[PDB]
Amino acid sequence: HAGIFTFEEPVTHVSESIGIMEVKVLRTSGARGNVIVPYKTIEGTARGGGEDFEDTCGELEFQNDEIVKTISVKVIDDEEYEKNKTFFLEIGEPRLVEGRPILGEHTKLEVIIEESYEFKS
């Protein structure tokens, strides 16, 4: 009953102008105990280091009876263009804080950054 942890979905589209992207991690099928879920960003065709996004990583702590947490990623509205602009988040194996918590269905998330174009009326 410690929980099965998952992203909402495996692929998401966000605007280049979103500013802050808030990625959810859900705990399903049990919320007993304090658990951490490691996470990280990984570059795809989109670049980190504040080019298209700011890299981030850490451990999300779920307290007893807590079932949703948020990872906030800075998305930079890069003036430069790609046909398909992607990066990823991943969750890693959960750990009890000193049953067993595990990963569920969506453990990798592809983020597609959608580009918009400036036209004048």
Swiss-Prot record:
Residues 1-92 form the Calx-beta domain. Ca(2+) 5 binds at E16, D78, E80, E115. Changing E16L: Abolishes regulation by micromolar Ca(2+). Ca(2+) 6 binds at D52, D78, E79, E80. Cardiac sarcolemma (at protein level). It is found in: Cell membrane; Cell membrane, Sarcolemma. Changing K85E: Decreases affinity for Ca(2+), but retains regulation by micromolar Ca(2+). Coiled coil: none annotated. Mediates the exchange of one Ca(2+) ion against three to four Na(+) ions across the cell membrane, and thereby contributes to the regulation of cytoplasmic Ca(2+) levels and Ca(2+)-dependent cellular processes. Contributes to Ca(2+) transport during excitation-contraction coupling in muscle. In a first phase, voltage-gated channels mediate the rapid increase of cytoplasmic Ca(2+) levels due to release of Ca(2+) stores from the endoplasmic reticulum. SLC8A1 mediates the export of Ca(2+) from the cell during the next phase, so that cytoplasmic Ca(2+) levels rapidly return to baseline. Belongs to the Ca(2+):cation antiporter (CaCA) (TC 2.A.19) family. SLC8 subfamily. The cytoplasmic Calx-beta domains bind the regulatory Ca(2+). The first Calx-beta domain can bind up to four Ca(2+) ions. The second domain can bind another two Ca(2+) ions that are essential for calcium-regulated ion exchange. This is Sodium/calcium exchanger 1. It comes from Canis lupus familiaris (Dog). The lineage of its organism: Eukaryota, Metazoa, Chordata, Craniata, Vertebrata. The gene is SLC8A1.
